[PDB]
Amino acid sequence: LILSEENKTNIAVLNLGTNDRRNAVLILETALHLVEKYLGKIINTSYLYETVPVNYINELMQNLEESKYEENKELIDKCEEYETFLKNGKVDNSILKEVNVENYLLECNNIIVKNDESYFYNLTVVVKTFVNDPLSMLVVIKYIEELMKIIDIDILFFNDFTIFMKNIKLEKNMIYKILSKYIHLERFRDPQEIINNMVDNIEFLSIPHVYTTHRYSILLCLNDMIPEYKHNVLNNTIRCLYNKYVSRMKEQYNINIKENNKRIYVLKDRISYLKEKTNIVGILNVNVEPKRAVQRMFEMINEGASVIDIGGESFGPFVIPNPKISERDLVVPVLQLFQKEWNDIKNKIVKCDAKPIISIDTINYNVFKECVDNDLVDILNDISACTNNPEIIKLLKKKNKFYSVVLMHKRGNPHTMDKLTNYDNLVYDIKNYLEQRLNFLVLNGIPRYRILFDIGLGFAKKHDQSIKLLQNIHVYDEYPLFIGYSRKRFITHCMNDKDQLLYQKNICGGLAIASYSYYKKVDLIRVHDVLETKSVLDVLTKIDQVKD
């Protein structure tokens, strides 16, 4: 009943590990892609963590064998099997032989004790899987591992099952037989010489995985995705287990474990440590001739911007509608000239890790599709938090690429914004709103660690409400936070040729908010005045660097 024709939908929790800091993202993201291709749908992910307890991949992705199972990108609002899995409601009897608590505890404990005798990059995922059983799932997992010619993908959970199968002998053609049930094996190029590897790689099978409740890096991840979840073989919920291990660490060793184990977010393709640097995002409001616009982009890189945010649709208050030129026509050419002039890499080839991350400020599906088709951008800055056209969420995943996104809170539009100002609980309403939005992308397979939050200063907030959101920015301490205060009316509201005076004050007032952001450890600030902001951040950094 192992290769039962009775196709099912099960819930599996995986753990993905690599050891290589420089390639972690590509490595783990490659694994993510091969999970979505080969196992089912990703419907949850944790953050990426650095824990302390080359490029054949690019052309692996070309030469993949087709799955025998379909991919479906339609947005879902809800997933019933997941609700069921979280709740410990009823599912179909395991096809693999279970063990009771007592035996699991012993046979688990046994494996730990017996095991008694660098950097690690961790990530968990929930998969709604069409694979029948954990052992099969492992087979496929071992395929994926061997494909990536470096990666350790463990099965943390698989429904409410408890399984300790003690010795596993799998015939060389059963392994082929299993894979074929789920993959259009080309019978890399040749699957023959992969099988013989996997022959010995499955010794036993423990569900839950042995270390689930014993490795910090595991509980850290699971705490992100499924904090209220209580498996049968656990004293308490993930949260409690997580909390207990954190506070307990302070007693046994006075350790404060968060310090070793750093949360990560990703803007393009490298690690960023949450709360460890205030990146500048320079604004390019194209509203300006391509060549000119591109000079500005170059000015900005050199003035110290990590990110350029280009937009051709003005989202500021009461701004004028003018039918003359389309958002596409403004932004796409500019990005194309940029990518051209950058690619003239006769200049130092080492200065291509100088390349700015490119962000496009749009809600328009058509604009983003062209940008992504033509590799012109890295990030979607969607000021509707992807609510205006959620189809846009499907553009954040390619076969072998993930894009990051900024989710901003607003109400209404440029004309109505200033009216839509009532909030029962301003700070938490908005936070809860961004959490609801993040949950939505995450259910739809956007990596949690590629999603950035923005409270949308000046968008359906009075000026006191904008200040109040800054005063309470601490509520974002756990999240990658992106803000834009630059040149907004609320700065000027704070102050004791009239219009030139006011401009300067407003720019200088923004540098105060650069200072505040720096101390609040805001991850990105969206600014017009890049040289000024960089000067501020450089000085505050020196004042912090306390080495002799």
Ligand X SMILES: Nc1nc(O)c2nc(CNc3ccc(C(=O)O)cc3)cnc2n1
Ligand Y SMILES: Nc1ncnc2c1ncn2[C@@H]1O[C@H](COP(=O)(O)OP(=O)(O)OP(=O)(O)O)[C@@H](O)[C@H]1O
Ligand Z SMILES: Nc1ncnc2c1ncn2[C@@H]1O[C@H](COP(=O)(O)O)[C@@H](O)[C@H]1O
> Which amino acid, residue 202?
I
DSSP secondary structure letters along 213-251: GT-HHHHHHHHHH-TT---TT-SS-HHHHHHHHHHHHHH
Where are any strands of DSSP class E within 323-417? 357-361, 379-382, 397-398, 401-402, 404-408
Q: Is 532 annotated as a binding residue?
A: yes
Contact (Cβ atoms closer than 8 angstroms) between residue 126 and residue 82: yes
CB of 340 to Mg ion, least distance (A): 45
Decide: is 107 part of the binding site for ligand Y (CB under 6 A).
no
The set of residues, in sequence order, having a beta carbon less than 8 Å from that of 332 and lying 6+ positions away, is 367, 370, 371, 374, 376
Decide: is 383 part of the binding site for ligand X (CB under 6 A).
yes
- DSSP assignment letter at 476: G
> Binding segment for Mg ion among 26-34, 147-155, 270-278, 343-351 (CB under 5 A)?
147-155
> Binding segment for Mg ion among 71-79, 152-160, 222-230, 501-509 (CB under 5 A)?
152-160
The set of residues, in sequence order, having a beta carbon less than 8 Å from that of 113 and lying 6+ positions away, is none
Out of 152, 303, 418, 435, point to the residue binding Mg ion (CB under 5 A).
152
What the block records as the tokens of 91 is 């599912």
State which of positions 105-144 bind ligand Z (CB under 6 A).
138
**What does 202 interact with, of ligand Z, Ca ion, ligand X, none (CB < 5 to 8 A by kind)?**
ligand Z
Preceding omega of 208 cis (within 30 degrees of 0): yes
Decide: is 154 part of the binding site for ligand Z (CB under 6 A).
yes
State which of positions 52-91 bind Ca ion (CB under 5 A).
71
Rounded to an integer, what distance in angstroms lies between the CA atom of residue 78 and that of residue 459? 29
For residues 187 to 216, the per-residue mask of contacts with ligand Y, x marking binding by CB under 6 A and - elsewhere, is --------------xxxxxxx-x-------
> Binding segment for Ca ion among 29-37, 168-176, 358-366, 442-450 (CB under 5 A)?
29-37
Where are any strands of DSSP class E within 251-373? 262-266, 271-273, 279-285, 307-311, 357-361
What the block records as the tokens of 138 is 């492992």
Contact (Cβ atoms closer than 8 angstroms) between residue 286 and residue 312: yes
Q: Which is nearer to ligand Y, 154 or 160 (CB)?
A: 154
Q: Which is nearer to ligand X, 315 or 342 (CB)?
A: 315
- H/E element holding 158? strand 152-158
Out of 456, 480, 509, 510, point to the residue binding ligand X (CB under 6 A).
456
Q: How many residues sit close enough to Ca ion to count as binding (CB under 5 A)? A: 3
The set of residues, in sequence order, having a beta carbon less than 8 Å from that of 491 and lying 6+ positions away, is 485, 505, 506, 509, 510, 513
Nearest to 104 by CA among 255, 259, 239, 209: 209
Name the β-bridge partners of 67.
183
- DSSP assignment letter at 447: -
Q: Which is nearer to ligand Z, 145 or 454 (CB)?
A: 145
Q: Is 477 annotated as a binding residue?
A: no
CB of 79 to Ca ion, least distance (A): 13
Q: Which is nearer to Mg ion, 44 or 206 (CB)?
A: 206
Q: Which is nearer to ligand Z, 210 or 455 (CB)?
A: 210
Distance from the Cα of residue 471 to its chain's centroid: 27
Q: Is 206 annotated as a binding residue?
A: yes
CB of 367 to a second copy, least distance (A): 34
Out of 27, 135, 207, 297, point to the residue binding ligand Z (CB under 6 A).
207
**Closest residue to ligand X, Cβ-based?**
484
- Footprint of a second copy (CB under 8 A): 304, 425-428, 431-432, 467, 470-472, 475, 491, 494-496, 501, 504-506, 508-513, 515-516, 519, 531-532, 534-544, 546
Nearest to 224 by CA among 212, 211, 213, 239: 239
Name the β-bridge partners of 284.
310
Out of 356, 484, 509, 510, point to the residue binding ligand X (CB under 6 A).
484
Decide: is 36 part of the binding site for Ca ion (CB under 5 A).
yes
State which of positions 518-547 bind ligand X (CB under 6 A).
526
Q: Rounded to 5 degrees, what are φ and ψ at 458?
A: 75, 0
Decide: is 206 part of the binding site for ligand Z (CB under 6 A).
yes
Decide: is 433 part of the binding site for ligand X (CB under 6 A).
no
Out of 66, 174, 197, 204, point to the residue binding ligand Z (CB under 6 A).
204
Q: Is 189 annotated as a binding residue?
A: no
The residues of the shown chain that bind ligand Y, judged by CB under 6 A, are 138, 152, 154-155, 201-207, 209
